[PDB]
Amino acid sequence: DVSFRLSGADPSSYGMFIKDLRNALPHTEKVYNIPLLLPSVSGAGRYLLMHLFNYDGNTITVAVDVTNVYIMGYLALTTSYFFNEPAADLASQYVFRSARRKITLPYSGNYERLQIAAGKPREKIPIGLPALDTAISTLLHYDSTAAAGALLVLIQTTAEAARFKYIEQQIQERAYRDEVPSSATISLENSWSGLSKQIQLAQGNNGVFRTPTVLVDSKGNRVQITNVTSNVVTSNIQLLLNTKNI
Numbered sequence: 001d002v003s004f005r006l007s008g009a010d011p012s013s014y015g016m017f018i019k020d021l022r023n024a025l026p027h028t029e030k031v032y033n034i035p036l037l038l039p040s041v042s043g044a045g046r047y048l049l050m051h052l053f054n055y056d057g058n059t060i061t062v063a064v065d066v067t068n069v070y071i072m073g074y075l076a077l078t079t080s081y082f083f084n085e086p087a088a089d090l091a092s093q094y095v096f097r098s099a100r101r102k103i104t105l106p107y108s109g110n111y112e113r114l115q116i117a118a119g120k121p122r123e124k125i126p127i128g129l130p131a132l133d134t135a136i137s138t139l140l141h142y143d144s145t146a147a148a149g150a151l152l153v154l155i156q157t158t159a160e161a162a163r164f165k166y167i168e169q170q171i172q173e174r175a176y177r178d179e180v181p182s183s184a185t186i187s188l189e190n191s192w193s194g195l196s197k198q199i200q201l202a203q204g205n206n207g208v209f210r211t212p213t214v215l216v217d218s219k220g221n222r223v224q225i226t227n228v229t230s231n232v233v234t235s236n237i238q239l240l241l242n243t244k245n246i
């Protein structure tokens with residue numbers, strides 16, 4: 001399992017956690033030098049457990065689907081929580097079985113539903129290491145409205161940073177001060193599946209995307225990604241959602 005302690009955390013130790021997170025996701029091939037997540041995995045092998053410790057040393061364990069880096073649920077003390085989605089319900093068959101009770105959250109895990117439940121878009125939710133500490137704290141005591149906002153933070157500070165080096169760097173800059181995500185950060189999150197697909201299709205297309213992917217850059221300008229030479233491909237993205245799952 002992969003572990004992260006907010007007590008004494010600094011950009012370096014958080015860098016190490018995110019490296020571990022990526023290293024725990026299995027793959028058999030690379031496509032243009034980027035690990036390609038597997039089409040599927042059967043049983044409990046499908047799910048990685050992340051141990052997260054807040055500053056006061058309290059912990060949660062988060063279950064992550066290794067084929068797509070999606071959070072399915074988490075354990076907080078003796079209570080398990082799982083999204084209201086069939087994927088998570090299936091996961092509940094394999095992790096945290098020894099929880100004293102199982103609570104199903106009143107939303108699915110996708111950003112759009114989480115933002116509704118939280119009552120705000122992640123454009124206005126500050127993220128960073130302090131926010132992750134807070135998020136962990138919030139998830140320890142069930143509130144479902146507060147938990148939605150806390151999961152938006154957790155997702156972005158764990159999964160999305162694993163997917164993209166630019167996002168991991170954003171979080172490192174927010175090690176001791178939160179800040180809502182840049183628009184580019186949001187655009188990357190939203191393009192992961194698309195980018196993953198197009199990079200894969202590029203393999204029999206001389207490195208050229210079948211359909212260009214539209215991002216936003218750090219300056220706020222709308223940018224077109226058309227091929228694998230782009231820095232998004234060459235430097236930023238770190239994991240590829242397998243087209244079998246798109």
Ligand SMILES: CC(=O)N[C@@H]1[C@@H](O)[C@H](O)[C@@H](CO)O[C@H]1O
Nearest residue numbers: 069070071109110111112155159
């Ligand atoms: C990446 C992660 O860990 N969790 C969620 C996932 O449940 C959902 O499928 C999608 C958002 O629309 O990506 C993240 O928000």
Ligand SMILES: *[C@@H]1O[C@H](CO)[C@@H](O)[C@H](O)[C@H]1NC(C)=O
Nearest residue numbers: 208224225226227228229230
């Ligand atoms: C591919 O992308 C690079 C960077 O965007 C650009 O300079 C180049 O003209 C593009 N080449 C092709 C063949 O699309």
